[PDB]
Write a protein that binds this ligand. Structure first.
Ligand SMILES: [Mn+2]
Ligand SMILES: [Mn+2]
Lengths: 293, 534
């Protein structure tokens, strides 16, 4: 029962690693298993070092394979993805399918969080719904993926000091106890603590301010320092903005933006980076470029 | 032109019910006001300025010759720390708005008072509720200080000008729930020390209590920006002689509303000259008033005035039109108007216009007439004797209209005063120098203040250093910036960096990027031999 299912999972992973999507029943069973697995996880997933945290993938299977070739194989080293792997990409279903397969196969070796694109109103206006309608014919795989995205955890706590999350800080949130007491099994609204946790952006503002995106606020350096001092944290990892070097430090080395999607939208032509944290909490920024196709 | 006055005082650090301080709410309100004003296709000529509660060298953040980028950058990094010096800040803002007035020709004080030379400006003065301090205690009078008057400012005796409105926002947001949402369409007043100062200029003072009320007041404020022609009306002296369709009994007497002088610069003639009798020899000129004390009298007096006189359409903003609407908007009839305070040699007021309404009965057209129209309109040596009742300098503009017909006058008697021309160019030069000195040191702060001032309680000269925010320690260049913990690893890193002999070496350990990372800015410094012809 368990060995045959494990072998089926390995076969599914090997098939996905060759630009080959699964069938309707296989994706349905994978989404069901991921739903039963992610139910036990809390809003703040306690991740233990050593790890290799990544950023946005935005549905880029070739860039994901390049990342795996750069930052070690998936079963070998740990991975921490911070959302944005479903929209703005030609191969978007394959990336999320491989990620959820690795999650259901290596639940203790890989962690994935929820981003602003993991919803039902964003995937319909960025091409993911169109890709699911074109590839699988019907619109059931998209429904399964959007129903599964509600079970993804919000943030992650690495070594009790690093606080990884897609969007960023929130004005209605002052401690991690408020984040742990949130109902993540809900569609991302236009306002609230979860919307700010998934739509925030750092800047040199100071205090707060409305974001130009349309949702979430914009905090400054003093707010980041207050959040890091009132929760025992030493760093806040995020992946929501487009950078060039791959990693960007802000607020006196308090916020780290890690964009791991090389050649964003195939028009910028930038690099990407991941942060490998060793056992002694030593960080190394591994950079890479888009692999040639 | 819009000059936003955000105090950024220490009293603006209290948190609202939403979770953000009053300063963050004020900045968000300013940003939404920007995005609301951008909807109207008229925001391509205005200029935004910023004024905070800081020292005179540090109060102004963005003034003249400052684009929107630096203004937004300065408003972004606003810090709320300091006392509530409202009077000094208002004085500094009014002096900043009156820097380029004595040089272009606006308010020349010698040739009438031209209303078509406008320089609109709206102040928001977003401050706290009450309890303003002046480093000694808490005052309750709000008196503007007079310590260093600008050269050429004693001719107005008031800080504000002909077109300078003052709106106010107090941001009285509760801290628990702000559940006060009974009256939907109702914006009350703040009832504070800034309320009389705002009402004197001509703008009300909103009382923000809820975010919905804030949005309502911001959407109501965007509809109150136009050409600034503010004149004051008085009921004296007719004892409410409105016996046309009913009996009079009122509050629509001291109307100090504005007038929309829309252009077709503005085009117009026949200005309100002055309020005094100008003499031929006068070294000292009496100070003018920002709001002209002009009074109207309810008399029919042949309201039909048809001639080749150049036409004016200075539209009046409806604020006290209830008294006119009570009399059916006075159809086919008007009432004269006259300026007080010795408009002539020996008389009390001279009718120089009327307030006839339009055919549509929508608003008041404010028909401005010459100094004395009912005589020159209807030569047998008559004009030579008639031109003695009008002020001398007033022969300037009217002669231009005579240019449409002929030219019987000359420059023989075109002289205002031999002493008024003197001591005027020097004042203009001093004002220009002051404006240049103010616009020069506008963004260069150069604080350089970091010391602890160690008191006795190397002697009498020691001062401990303070924590520098933007220090940027050079780890590879300076050896003192390397702490003890990561010393050996950093030593090996510096050794490998020096022994690598790479290209374009630097002294920074890890300088990722700045706060902003633009895509086009990085893509411009590249070369792509492709055009996508297919
Ligand atoms: Mn994204
Ligand atoms: Mn995102």
């Amino acid at each position: 029962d368990e060995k045959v299912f494990t072998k089926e999972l390995d076969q599914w992973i090997e098939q996905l690693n060759e630009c080959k999507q699964l069938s309707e029943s296989q994706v349905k069973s994978l989404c069901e298993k991921a739903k039963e697995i992610l139910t036990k996880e809390s809003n703040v997933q306690e991740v233990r070092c050593p790890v290799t945290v990544c950023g946005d993938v935005h549905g880029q299977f070739h860039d994901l394979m390049e990342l795996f070739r750069i930052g070690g194989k998936s079963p070998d080293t740990n991975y921490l993805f911070m959302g944005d792997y479903v929209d703005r990409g030609y191969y978007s279903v394959e990336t999320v399918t491989l990620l959820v397969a690795l999650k259901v196969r290596y639940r203790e070796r890989i962690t994935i969080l929820r981003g602003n694109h993991e919803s039902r109103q964003i995937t319909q206006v960025y091409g993911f719904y169109d890709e699911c309608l074109r590839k699988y014919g019907n619109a059931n795989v998209w429904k399964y993926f959007t129903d599964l995205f509600d079970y993804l955890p919000l943030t992650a706590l690495v070594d009790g000091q690093i606080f990884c999350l897609h969007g960023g800080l929130s004005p209605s949130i002052d401690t991690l106890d408020h984040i742990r007491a949130l109902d993540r099994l809900q569609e991302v609204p236009h306002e609230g603590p979860m919307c700010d946790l998934l739509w925030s952006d750092p800047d040199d503002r100071g205090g707060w301010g409305i974001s130009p995106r349309g949702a979430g606020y914009t905090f400054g350096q003093d707010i980041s320092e207050t959040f890091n001092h009132a929760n025992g944290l030493t760093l806040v990892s995020r992946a929501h903005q487009l950078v060039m070097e791959g990693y960007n430090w802000c607020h006196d080395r308090n916020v780290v933006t890690i964009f791991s999607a090389p050649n964003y939208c195939y028009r910028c032509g930038n690099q990407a980076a991941i942060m490998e944290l060793d056992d002694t909490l030593k960080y190394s920024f591994l950079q890479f470029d888009p692999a040639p196709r | 032109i819009l000059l936003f006055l955000i105090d950024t005082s220490a009293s603006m650090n209290q948190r609202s019910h939403l979770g953000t301080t009053y300063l963050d709410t004020a900045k968000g309100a300013v940003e939404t006001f920007m995005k609301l004003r951008a909807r109207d296709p008229a925001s391509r000529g205005d200029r935004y300025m910023l004024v905070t509660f800081e020292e005179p060298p540090y109060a102004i953040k963005a003034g003249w010759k400052e684009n929107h980028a630096t203004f937004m950058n300065e408003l972004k990094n606003l810090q709320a720390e300091g006392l509530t010096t409202l009077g000094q800040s208002l004085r500094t803002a009014f002096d900043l708005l009156n820097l380029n007035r004595l040089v272009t020709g606006i308010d020349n004080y010698g040739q009438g008072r031209n209303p078509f030379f406008l320089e609109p400006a709206i102040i928001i003065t977003i401050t706290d509720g009450s309890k303003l301090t002046t480093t000694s205690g808490v005052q309750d009078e709000l008196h503007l200080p007079l310590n260093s008057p600008l050269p050429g400012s004693e001719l107005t005796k008031e800080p504000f000008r002909w077109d300078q409105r003052l709106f106010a926002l107090v941001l009285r947001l509760p801290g628990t729930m702000s559940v006060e949402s009974e009256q939907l369409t109702g914006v009350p007043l703040d009832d504070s020390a800034i309320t009389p100062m705002c009402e004197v200029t001509g703008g009300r003072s909103y009382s923000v209590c809820s975010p919905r009320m804030l949005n309502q007041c911001l959407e109501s404020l965007v509809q109150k920006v136009q050409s600034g022609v503010v004149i004051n009306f008085e009921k004296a002296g007719p004892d409410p002689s409105p016996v046309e369709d009913g009996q009079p009994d009122g509050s629509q007497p001291w109307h100090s509303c504005h007038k929309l002088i829309y252009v077709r610069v503005p085009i117009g003639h026949w200005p309100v000259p002055e309020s005094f009798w100008p003499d031929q020899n006068s070294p000292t000129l009496p100070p003018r008033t920002s709001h002209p004390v002009v009074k109207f009298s309810c008399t029919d007096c042949e309201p039909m005035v048809i001639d080749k006189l150049p036409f004016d359409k200075y539209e009046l903003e409806p604020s006290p039109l209830t008294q006119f609407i009570l009399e059916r908007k006075s159809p086919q009839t008007c009432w004269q108007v006259y300026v007080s305070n010795s408009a002539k040699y020996s008389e009390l007021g001279h009718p120089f216009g009327y307030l006839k309404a339009s055919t549509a009965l929508n608003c008041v057209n404010l028909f401005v007439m010459p100094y004395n129209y009912p005589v020159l309109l209807p030569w047998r040596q008559s004009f030579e004797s008639y031109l003695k009742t009008m002020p001398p300098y007033y022969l300037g503009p009217l002669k231009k209209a005579v240019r449409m017909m002929g030219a019987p006058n000359l420059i023989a008697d075109s002289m205002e005063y031999g002493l008024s021309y003197s001591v005027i160019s020097y004042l203009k030069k001093l004002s220009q120098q002051a404006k240049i000195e103010s616009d020069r040191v506008i963004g260069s702060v150069g604080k350089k203040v970091v010391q602890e001032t160690g008191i006795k309680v190397e002697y009498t000269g020691f001062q401990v250093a303070l924590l520098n925010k933007d220090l940027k320690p050079q780890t590879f260049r300076n050896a003192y910036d390397i702490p003890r913990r990561n010393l050996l690893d950093h030593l090996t890193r510096m050794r490998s960096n020096l022994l690598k002999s790479t290209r374009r070496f630097l002294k920074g350990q890890d300088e990722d990027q700045v706060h902003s990372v633009p895509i086009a800015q990085m893509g411009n410094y590249q070369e792509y031999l492709k055009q996508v012809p297919s």
